[PDB]
Amino acid sequence: PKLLYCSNGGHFLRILPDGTVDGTRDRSDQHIQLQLSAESVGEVYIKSTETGQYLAMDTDGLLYGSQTPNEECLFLERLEENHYNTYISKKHAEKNWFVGLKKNGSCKRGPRTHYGQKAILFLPLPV
Incomplete structure (x- = not known):
């Protein structure tokens, strides 16, 4: 039950219905x-605790919201040197594509x- 805060412009990541x-x-x-749920380590x-959509x-x-799970919905978590987190599209791991937001959210x-x-960079926040 977590909030993901983006260091960039100070937005919480949000999956609209x-x-x-x-x-x-x-x-x-x-x-x-x-809701962040680990498959492997x-x-x-x-996932949204409010719509059940998957990022x-x-x-x-x-980035979009996926109504059902799949290959595109898996992301590689890395804890960074500060307390923040990065997230790579596993399906596009080679292409080194991160989740990220611009400064206007x-x-x-x-x-x-x-x-x-x-x-x-995203900071997980226990709600």
Whole structure:
């Protein structure tokens, strides 16, 4: 029962019911309560506790909400040097595509992500 805070512009990661991932700063928002559930070690699904949608990155690197689970919904967790976390699309691990948000709280597509950005750091917060 966790919130994922993005260091970049200070948004909590948010899966809107229509599949559009983005960020909000509103703590009472329903769609930010997430559940991180480990398949293997350092291999998680990221799910909304409010819609049951799964976070997923498609072929273009666009993050969306997946209504059912699958290959695209798995992400590689890495704890970073501070207390923050990065998350790679397992299905696109080679392409080194992270979950990330821009500074205005919008999805920063995989292609345009990379290491050393503040877009890709997230701080899990127990709700």
